Design a binder for this molecule. Structure first.
Ligand code: CL
Ligand code: FE
Length: 186
């Protein structure tokens, strides 16, 4: 029975219930993420920015079932085109706006990766992707507003691929945490 999360802590408690088993009800998880109304005071601890690129800030390890993290995007910061390592990805906006550009998996032949579509994800909205759907790039294209997003990855993963938009060629990337549980982790 899905109830509205009252706070980030309540959300986390509900997520531990939704991931208690071995499968994932994507629509329920997305609905509860969307229903949490972002409260900046509740997540300020995790919102640690870097001047030069976006940061990944671990919030909860989901009793091993998921990584819940907060990504902090300075003005003009964005990601590579990337996959999600056979995991679910839920992305909820906590502050600002992000542009999500979708791409299909490349063919073996070296070719330009052409976007399928793009959209603007707005405060409190929750997007979903997995490798069966395709690849994406996420960007804060704002010149004046930092963005903050809440990401849930299940199962957790520490590597993925970045794709060269010019060729479709992929390279393995190891993701690093800027902080864990509010503590800077150099
Ligand atoms: Cl992502
Ligand atoms: Fe992603």
């Amino acid at each position: 029975e899905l109830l509205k999360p009252r706070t980030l802590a309540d959300l986390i408690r509900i997520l531990h219930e939704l991931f208690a088993g071995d499968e994932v009800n994507v629509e329920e998880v997305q609905a509860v993420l969307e229903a949490y109304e972002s409260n900046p005071a509740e997540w300020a601890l995790y919102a640690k920015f870097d001047q030069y690129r976006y940061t990944r800030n671990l919030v909860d390890q989901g009793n091993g079932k998921f990584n819940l993290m907060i990504l902090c995007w300075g003005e003009g910061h964005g990601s590579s085109i990337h996959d999600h390592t056979d995991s679910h990805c839920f992305l909820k906006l906590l502050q600002g706006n992000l542009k999500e550009t979708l791409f299909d998996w490349p063919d073996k032949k070296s070719n330009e990766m052409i976007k399928k579509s793009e959209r603007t994800l707005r405060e409190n909205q929750c997007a979903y992707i997995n490798d069966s759907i395709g690849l994406h790039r996420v960007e804060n294209v704002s010149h004046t507003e930092p963005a903050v997003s809440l990401h849930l990855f299940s199962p957790p993963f520490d590597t993925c691929h970045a794709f060269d938009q010019r060729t479709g060629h992929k390279n393995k990337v190891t993701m690093t945490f800027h902080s864990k549980f509010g503590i800077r982790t150099p």
